[PDB]
Amino acid sequence: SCQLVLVESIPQDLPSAAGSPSAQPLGQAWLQLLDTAQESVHVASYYWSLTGPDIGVNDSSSQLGEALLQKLQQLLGRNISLAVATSSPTLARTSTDLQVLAARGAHVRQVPMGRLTRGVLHSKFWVVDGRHIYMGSANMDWRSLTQVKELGAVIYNCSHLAQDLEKTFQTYWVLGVPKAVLPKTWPQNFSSHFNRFQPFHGLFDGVPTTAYFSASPPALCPQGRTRDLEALLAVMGSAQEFIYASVMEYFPTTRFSHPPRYWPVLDNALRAAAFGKGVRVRLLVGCGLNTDPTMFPYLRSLQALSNPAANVSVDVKVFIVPVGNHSNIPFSRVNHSKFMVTEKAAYIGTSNWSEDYFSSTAGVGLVVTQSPGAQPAGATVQEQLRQLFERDWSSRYAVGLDGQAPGQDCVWQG
């Protein structure tokens, strides 16, 4: 009886072409998920900024996030367990949401990924009632609800996947105990049940579906849990027609370490897929006022492989979100979606493509494969993701690596 719903958030002043595909709004889905839950809610988030004053800005668009916060407090009014795991080196330092929720009675246990693996807790997911889950790239932020284009999935009335996500969250929580040390081998309970070798089978809305999860870094991977890097390489290798991807940043290197090293695993996998199998490879990387200008040379190197004569297609584009009058809001107006679409599978993750997110920084990934069902009316998850990717690609907000019109509000060359 498992149900799967693609959810997404279009920011303000971003109209789409007529007839373009759309999914459920993020705010409505989050409100419905919070209302449905009646036993307990477990959230794994990088940071918490749900109010305008938390950042230090005052704007009407924050209202939605504020409402969500109120709903959370309303959840505390019905005596519902609420456990939060957040990275010790969190981003928003002046936020006070966690203190208010703790005062209301919500347990919050900071997990120090900075001391253990020299990274951060980038995972973002919800497990409510042990029956419904949500997983996306959306932080617990009003910007992610109203000012940042975002994507994710929500699974309803599904038990085993909820149990697996609960296992991962329990690993995070156990690590969050004060004065903790990485175990050499995780206990029996933390072992994952579904892997890429034996994915979880289900009847989603009446159609077959094989879905599984993946975790990172390798230290936080219990027995039987696929690494998110391994899942990415698997969904790349199994491709035979095309590969579409959309990430916020793409560096084939190590970002924050010393000395920096070249990390070609994803780049090599993409090139091998494009060459050996002759699959159409498309990349759509978001851009904004805060993106690192040094990413572009690697993108140009990737696109230089294009050669229709020899059956190579590695087209690459940058997604541009106009800033408009929202210049006061920091770290906003960017495309934060991270996902991959294939004719066989579909990957939704919460980590960028860099050595840190697969070596040190924690993260989770979800792989879904929906075979066509008896009723052809219901489009598969792969088809919906591909349609969304095509809508993003054909839109005027995406430009080629050569298009550098002055009115684009991006760093470009720095």
Place this chain on the structure above:
Amino acid sequence: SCQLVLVESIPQDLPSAAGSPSAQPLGQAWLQLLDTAQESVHVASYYWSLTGPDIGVNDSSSQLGEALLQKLQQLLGRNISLAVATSSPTLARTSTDLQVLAARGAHVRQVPMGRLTRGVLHSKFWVVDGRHIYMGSANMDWRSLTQVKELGAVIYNCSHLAQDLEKTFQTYWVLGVPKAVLPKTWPQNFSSHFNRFQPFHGLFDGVPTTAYFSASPPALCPQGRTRDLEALLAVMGSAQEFIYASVMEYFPTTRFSHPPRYWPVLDNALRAAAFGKGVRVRLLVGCGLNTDPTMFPYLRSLQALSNPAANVSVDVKVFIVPVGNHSNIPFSRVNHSKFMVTEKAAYIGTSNWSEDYFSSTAGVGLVVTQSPGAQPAGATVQEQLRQLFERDWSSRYAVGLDGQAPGQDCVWQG
């Protein structure tokens, strides 16, 4: 008392800039080497086309090659042992020089390389009297003498390295026995004694020198010998100032295997050296009428990584040779040099840069490092190689990847 000298052959009608550095001509070196022989001569060659009419053309430029054959016959007139190892799939099918030598009393032997490992005997080297060696990419052909640019190195009075090369020559010779198979483990007879970690040390002309050899494929590499790919990777990694490489063909893919695959080992090593260590990388690729156009996209990728601001500088150029009134010579007017020079070593190879060369075909490389001696003397082999590379790079015959002049000669986009 080893004496190592760099040798090279410049095709006619290819003048260089005034004051350009130059090495000893190849014809003189080969003539002197054949003149000094008094015990035996061993040669490993891909094909034999010394006679002008062999190919099917008549020209004055082949006269030099004829002389070489005469000298070989003169050797057969002085009771000098002569052994030849030739690949079973020879290129020049219409070859009669081997028949003439065999009739005179040679010891030719066809190595069934294609039957064994689906490759060819691309190794080309000379061992004279078990004391002198010659190693380069010049197959026995007058085109390499007068119509193809070529680089190599010869060593005099260096018995240890001569025996080391005799080891792999004996490997080829044993494999050349009719109805032979690849041994599971090579006997101690063919075991080497100098490798990358314990190179042959000596005083070359009063200058400290560490030199060693390589081999390929690993199936044909006996115990104690470094694979050519391993030597190339070591030379790339150990570099800290620059890497100047020149090859006729550069392919990060399997060349003739089916199905095609992506083999990024050399590409990954080059990118990692350029980025992590911040070393200047320059590549020079030969460009002739027979060059595969599909090679150009990959090169362009390596060119796109150039980011001078972020301490990542990679440059790629194509070296073309004007043809003019030299159209009747086939498979000529190409830059056949295959070598690499860093600030700490110098590698001279006889094989191109592709997966098949380092995994299926027979290839051999030589690595030489010359420390600055106490006496001023002249310049190290590294300095001479760097000077030759700079002269070629600054020449009018080397153009950028985007500099496709209409009056040029190479294939370019095909």
Place this chain on the structure above:
Amino acid sequence: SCQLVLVESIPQDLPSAAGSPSAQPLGQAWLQLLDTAQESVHVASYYWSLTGPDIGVNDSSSQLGEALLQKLQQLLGRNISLAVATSSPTLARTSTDLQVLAARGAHVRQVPMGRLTRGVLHSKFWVVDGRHIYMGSANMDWRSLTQVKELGAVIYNCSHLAQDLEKTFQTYWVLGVPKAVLPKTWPQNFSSHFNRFQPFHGLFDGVPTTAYFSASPPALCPQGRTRDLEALLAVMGSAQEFIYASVMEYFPTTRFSHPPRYWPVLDNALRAAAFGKGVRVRLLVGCGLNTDPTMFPYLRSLQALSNPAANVSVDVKVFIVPVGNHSNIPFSRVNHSKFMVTEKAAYIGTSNWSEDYFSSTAGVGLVVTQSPGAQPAGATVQEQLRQLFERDWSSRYAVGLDGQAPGQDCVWQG
């Protein structure tokens, strides 16, 4: 409503101890299954020797088998489809009943497992009307009905498990097509919805039950299916109290492949369960006048780990069958049972415990778990299996590895 019952065949002239547990006779269950058929019958078998003179023997003990064939023929007299899959290198090459059934109208496909995976179709299961199901270590042979002791399980009125085994039989049937090749990936139709971590739940006669299937080799194992080896290792590892096992042949080495190699997976699992978890281990191998004596030392290698002080308890015994006057029946009077019992689960398979049965030779097995329900009168299936194993263990026909004596029927080296 699913009714799962165990069945076993007691060989003629093989009395048991007074007041010993038993189960439903195999012949009666097979007759009931053939009588209740109304739509179709699908059979997967290794060979067919229903008739007595099929193997060239004139004995009354074959009469029962003859009757079965008669019933089968009567089935084809009621316009009921009959699908049969047999191994191409089948034993008893003088088989004639298969030709008779094919002439009467039964579709027969000979799976070429010999040329496909270098194995044989050792799997023997049975599907009736897509609703009833049988599986045991009993070939369609008269001597397997009255001269040889085996054990199997038959489930009545269970649709989902019947359809899963129908999917496996459809895999075999598709492979039986002339000029067929191994599919690298399997269509969605050949996909099991019940695996080890997601078994089929049911209320068999009230008591809850979790049952799932396993198939081998992995080449013939479709997506979502559990490999036999995986199921065996899972049941061995899950056990915390005791492990009982009965297999005709036990070899930790490859049997028919070249060159012979060690395959210690099952040995290692048994030893680890015995030592690390302190699990009592009892093993019962079979004996026959045609048995490989080289199996015996390995069993002794298992027997030596019998230190009661260190909480390591491993016992191994052999089961002899008195030949009596039945010396004229080839390949008979052998313990054919292949099953395994723990305190929590029960595995019933159609494969021996060598390497080839899990890499090349096809086989099928079932893992069933029954927990006590509201009514404790009905003993769990694991308890019945343990009772049968204890009856066999205490039988006079079972002797330890030291109980060699005159008059035994084992090969006993030689």
Place this chain on the structure above:
Amino acid sequence: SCQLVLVESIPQDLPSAAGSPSAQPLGQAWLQLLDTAQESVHVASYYWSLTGPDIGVNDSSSQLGEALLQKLQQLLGRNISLAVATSSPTLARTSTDLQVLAARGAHVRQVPMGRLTRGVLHSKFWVVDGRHIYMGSANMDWRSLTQVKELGAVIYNCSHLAQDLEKTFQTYWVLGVPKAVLPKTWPQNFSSHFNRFQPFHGLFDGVPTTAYFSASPPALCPQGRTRDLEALLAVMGSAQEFIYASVMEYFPTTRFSHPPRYWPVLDNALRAAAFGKGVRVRLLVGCGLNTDPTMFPYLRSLQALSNPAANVSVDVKVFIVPVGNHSNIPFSRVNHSKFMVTEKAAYIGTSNWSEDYFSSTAGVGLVVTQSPGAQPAGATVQEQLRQLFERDWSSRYAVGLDGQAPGQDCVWQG
């Protein structure tokens, strides 16, 4: 110009058979090695019990050991550097040798092996002057000179191998810094030159030789350093004629961790070598008054594998050293030799065969290999090791596992 010679220590009152092979005494070899020391001595040892009063006994057999200390003190009288690394959980808690040496001007660092990975520093070797090396199974104890049979190898005048071992000693030394932690990746300074794939190649007294070094635990192995476990696995797999192994204790299980686990890697490799290749396997374990009885059944398992008719020959014996009058000395009269000789290689180790010695406890191992060369008269190292092993095997102190004669000073069943 490297020289290799085996050196063994024969206990007091242990007369071997007349005309038996033998090598240099341990005490004289150590004294000569210390005399030849001129620059620095680096010693890695488990503990120090040089003097008799260290334990608290009064025996004349300690004389030699005390003299050794005197020699060491005389070394410190010549202003010679002396660095010693010992395990933090050392055995002899009363010894004052380290304190006396530190008073005289030594350099002692207590490596916190117990806290880093829950193990001990079982490695024992000497690096003298950076040119000579020694390594065996001898601790810095007088009990190791006149009361415990031991074996090791000493090498003179070999700079490369000495530097290779000095790299491991430097790893231990830097781990001995207070409050130090295990680095994620060891720097290039600790990278090993020679490993399994490219062993050091040299000429020992005119005999060609290949030799390398192996270290454990996996965590303390830098880049390019082969691990002891994989070294043993490869040496045993490459065997084709026989494998003669001698050790103190043989546990295919975890030794002192919790919970206990089965560790069959060495047992599986032994059985695979015995069966697949049909090699002759001989195992000789040393039993003393402190031997754990639980080892005996496991060995019996291997002895139960014997089957001459099937080309599977395995034999196991035990070595009993009579106590005689030497009953007051604790942990004495035990065969401490740990080595293994095959027809192609000879391995001399430091750690026993158990899980902890290859996962947590740190040890070092050497794999030498000599082939006939310019001095065929001189017996190779493997020949000498085989001769010593056969001398021990044929000695009256070697008793089969079935041998349970009274009066033997071995625990037996306990």
